[PDB]
Amino acid sequence: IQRPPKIQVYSRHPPEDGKPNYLNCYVYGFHPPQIEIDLLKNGEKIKSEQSDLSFSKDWSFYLLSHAEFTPNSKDQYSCRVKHVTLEQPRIVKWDRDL
């Protein structure tokens, strides 16, 4: 029981300032299943397009939240996850050089 979530913030296509992309936040390997995931632009939240809760032997419970977004050299994004294993909501930033 009590397993913290593993997170992956990434974009669908290699980003270029201008072309509309998609930002996905992959969260998995956690338990219990109740978990909240917010997508953030400069600190405030955006498109809550979330998948349906799924489970697997190899990654326990997992989810995928995504939003359409347009890259700029000034706007920064990140994924915020809230789970009973995190004393304070964990925030992972979208690094676009990884």
Q: Identify the CATH number of the domain in which residue 12 sits.
A: 2.60.40.10
Q: Which domain holds residue 74?
A: 1-98
Residues 3/35, Cβ–Cβ less than 8 Å: no
Total domain count, the chain: 1
Give the list of residues 6+ apart from residue 74 with CB closer than 8 angstroms, or none: none
Q: 90, exposed or middle or buried, with CB in 10 Å at 0-12, 13-18, 19+?
A: middle
Cα(62)–Cα(44) distance, integer angstroms? 24
Task: Enter the resolution in angstroms.
Answer: 2.5
- Check if the beta carbon of residue 18 is closer than 8 Å to that of residue 70: yes
Q: Method used for this model? A: X-ray
Q: What is the DSSP secondary structure assignment for residue 31, as one 8-state letter?
A: B
